[PDB]
Amino acid sequence: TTENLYFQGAHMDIHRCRFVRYPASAINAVAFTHSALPVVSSSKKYLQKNIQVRLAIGRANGDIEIWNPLNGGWYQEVIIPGGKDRSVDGLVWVTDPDEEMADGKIIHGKSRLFSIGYTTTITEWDLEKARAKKHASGQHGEIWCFGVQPLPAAQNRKLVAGTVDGNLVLYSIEDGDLKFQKTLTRTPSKKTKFVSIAFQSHNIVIVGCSNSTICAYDVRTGTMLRQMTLGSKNIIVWAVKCLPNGDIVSGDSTGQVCIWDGKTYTQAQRIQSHTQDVLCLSVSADGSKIISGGMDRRTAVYEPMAGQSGRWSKVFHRRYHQHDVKAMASFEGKGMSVVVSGGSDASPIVLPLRALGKEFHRTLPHLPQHPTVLSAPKARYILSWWENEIRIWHLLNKNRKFLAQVLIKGASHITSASISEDGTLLAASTPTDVKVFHLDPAAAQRNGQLYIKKVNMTGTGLGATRVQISPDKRWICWAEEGSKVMISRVHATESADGISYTVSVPHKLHRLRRQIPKHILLGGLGSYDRNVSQIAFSADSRMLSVADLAGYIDTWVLRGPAGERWARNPKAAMIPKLSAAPVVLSFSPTPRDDGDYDLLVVTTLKQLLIFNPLRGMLSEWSRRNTYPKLPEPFRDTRDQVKGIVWQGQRAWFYGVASLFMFDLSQDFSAKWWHTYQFRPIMGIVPIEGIPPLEVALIERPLS
């Protein structure tokens, strides 16, 4: 339960905590913005720099996570919240062709994301607002599968969905909308389910069924062109894919992977590859590799049989996951060649397509990139949240006490929370609300927990994606729908009762306009990367900074004489743009002699930078201690930093499986230290009782 680190005078006293039962949600769906990018040479590499490849991961709890593959440094960027009685069962990206403007500038095709969730509704997601963009339903059964019709027209794209009562339905996503368009087919039997879908060409849809059949349908007419029969009369074809040559690969409930000739629609081959249901398939872009995953937890790899034309041989199988393999998808481009699989064990697993089965796979964290753990250091509270409940514990100065379970009502999960250092002011957000609470350690209920008082806060009803209370408890800053920065004054009133809190109406804080060419803004993910990932106050609560995924840092200063106002930091525009997304944004608590601040940043590329924001520039320390001088273990981009803990002028940085300590009063060339003994880390948070440091280190192992 306890550990103690000592590095050349610095003591860290650790409470090793495993009692925060952060739940794992199964991965049900995996999908890339692009399956494949065109091959280009080093001379033409710069023609793909502005293409934005993202991975979407859909969870059983309805969460949708946007990941950036970052040439192997996988980084979880944004989590769009699910909600009570919501689940994601399928994901589809629709990415337009690139388009050349009259002046020869390339607009990279825009990417739109849709999902289905065991209902009659298809949902399109607003990546720019991290919330639902539109819902569309029709009179048909629950949708069990869907896909986008491939291009042969390009300005009038179509989705085809199969339902549980055996209907193909067509949805139009024309001119940026989403609506039910037409029912194509009604199977004779309402017990026949359409469970998997793939396109063989623009007009021919392949559908796996629950009645031991695979059917080919013409998209224009709805006519059944070909029926393929398997085997029982209840063989479920959970997965169908088409090879580049038009051949069909199927995976079914009996554990078989079958190959069907694309022209005759006859069974060319049967491979008894799994011992339980085959749930998912993946095919490489060149059609030379097939991947399958099953309820038997195994992943299998197939390659073309030497000599024999159009037939396949199983190369190997291996258990990568701890539970079933529910979904997988491949990406090939910019030197990357991977398949990503997922299942009930909640970890995404990345296999390198060019070196399968050689122990080069990677298991990505099952814990969110955001720590999702907080402390109130002066109160010795530790806090976490998931779904729609906040849990609060007290580490006694029977060293544990469960203080409160705060319920946040809403159709969606909590997106963010913040607590004051003394544990009396608590804030939490959803996409529809920003909620504020007043905590009194003397206010108890019969169930033993704290009595939590609501603090009135009026708002736009657009909620927030991140929320942050200032250290002096006078301000609450949040990011509304990712891109808009808001701030409210927290008014404390004293009386015989003690303190009572009220909150002002939100005030808008304006970020700098950035110079981004119109061909970049109009393509790919639009303004998705302006999503604010960090909000940071300085220790004196007189400066405020935010940074977004694109790497822009905005700064405000508090002007004294409610005679106070937040104003634009005069030298804000001089702060450079980061070349990679910030994972940490933190004001050093140590005052500077020149009255400026040390604003520290860590990026996904493991850059470590300190800016002096009032002067508007990189600090002298950063000018000496550049990237090549950082310790080689720290520069490993497979080790993503999640958080920071200050110890005076020493800074501690942790990832999911790593802990570093740098003495920032010193220059690099040893005076830096690290350890890998802690894993898997949710977060490390200080508590109060060379200054020694006392922290709660929260680990959340699954297996």
Numbering used by the authors: -10 to 141, 148 to 226, 233 to 398, 415 to 578, 610 to 717, 824 to 843, 855 to 868
Publication text:
The crystal structure of Utp4 was solved at a resolution of 2.15 Å by the single wavelength anomalous dispersion (SAD) method using seleno-methionine labelled protein. The overall architecture reveals the two propellers to be arranged in an orthogonal manner with the side of the N-terminal β-propeller 1 packing with β-strand 1D against the top of the C-terminal β-propeller 2. Most prominent, residues at the very N-terminus constituting the first β-strand form a basic surface patch, which is also conserved. While the N-terminal β-propeller 1 forms a continuous domain (residues 38–381), blade 14 is completed by parallel β-augmentation of the very N-terminus of Utp4 (β-strand 14C) and the N-terminal TEV cleavage site (anti-parallel β-strand 14D) introduced during cloning. In particular, a network of salt-bridges between conserved residues (R5-E864, R7-E864) help in stabilising the Velcro-closure suggesting a highly specific arrangement.
The earliest intermediate is the huge 90S pre-ribosome or small-subunit processome (SSU) that is co-transcriptionally assembled in the nucleolus by incorporation of several modular subcomplexes onto the nascent pre-rRNA. The UTP-A complex is presumably the earliest complex that associates with the nascent 35S rRNA and binds to the 5'-end of the 5'-ETS up to the binding site for the U3 3'-hinge. Utp4 is positioned in the center of the UTP-A complex and scaffolds large parts of the 5'-ETS.
